[PDB]
């Protein structure tokens with residue numbers, strides 16, 4: 457059913473609504489001081505080569521694991537699965553984490569844009585709907601920054617070294 | 633004289649380059665040790681060796697400083713140092729660190745802002761013993777040095793508190809090359 461227009465519209469609508477929340481809402485992660493001057497998040501333009509199908513390889517025996525955080529004690533996740541996918545000509549894997557009380561898998565990553573400074577230095581996050589082992593949708597046009605990227609003092613989970621993708625993921629949120 | 637003082641400072645900078653350049657425990661990442669060409673300093677200027685009024689905390693309090701990585705660092709607020717640079721008066725808060733006899737004085741100045749010295753600020757060690765209020769202690773900004781993370785390693789170093797900004801160009805002690 458889903459048209460390309462529908463998908464692009466959905467992404468557009470999401471980035472606009474998000475901008476609105478960040479710019480005006482009391483619980484916005486943008487520090488109050490900087491809200492007036494806030495001009496919207498920066499994004500790569502939408503790109504379908506970064507909207508890929510991932511093979512879902514669930515953890516045989518889901519394991520309690522922890523990720524470093526930027527300002528705090530390590531955060532506790534369950535290793536939930538391996539996501540396997542292709543970007544252009546190369547195959548990649550990312551570990552997906554189960555978060556208590558959240559239905560989507562948490563997939564923090566870094567890529568070559570992390571390294572060259574086009575995207576956030578500590579990396580980016582992707583949410584992935586597990587429902588219900590087979591193939592899931594990996595849309596890096598939906599990659600977003602951790603809260604701490606906006607100046608406030610938040611302790612956020614850091615991507616494991618194993619979740620670096622050796623490729624330029626020119627999709628999703630950037631920092632300009 | 634100024635000569636013994638200059639010599640001692642010059643000796644310290646040399647020995648420190650030596651250590652950074654060749655020692656296994658150097659904060660210079662192993663990858664860059666061979667290319668390493670020494671730290672960078674402003675020339676030794678006696679106008680930045682000032683007498684500071686020691687004003688000890690009446691009731692020293694546990695405080696926290698933000699760090700470059702990981703949780704805040706825990707220190708005790710031990711004293712205010714008040715001093716003049718050069719026609720203007722300033723105060724810096726000095727911190728007592730567990731197990732170290734010298735007070736820790738992390739700071740920033742206009743060289744931080746203009747990019748001539750390290751972006752996160754610089755550190756100064758000050759020997760408190762055995763001064764009362766208000767005895768003088770020597771504040772020698774020629775001895776200002778960089779946090780470990782200035783060299784590229786992924787260290788956790790304490791950030792100077794906001795009120796430890798000195799509104800002046802402290803052209804003494806360790807500097808950085810911005811072009812690198």
Ligand code: EMC
Pocket residue numbers: 601602603604610611612613
């Ligand atoms: C972006 C979660 Hg602190």
Ligand code: EMC
Pocket residue numbers: 778779780781787788789790
């Ligand atoms: C310079 C302390 Hg990591």
Ligand code: NA
Pocket residue numbers: 581600601602603
């Ligand atoms: Na976030």
Ligand code: NA
Pocket residue numbers: 755777778779780
């Ligand atoms: Na240091």
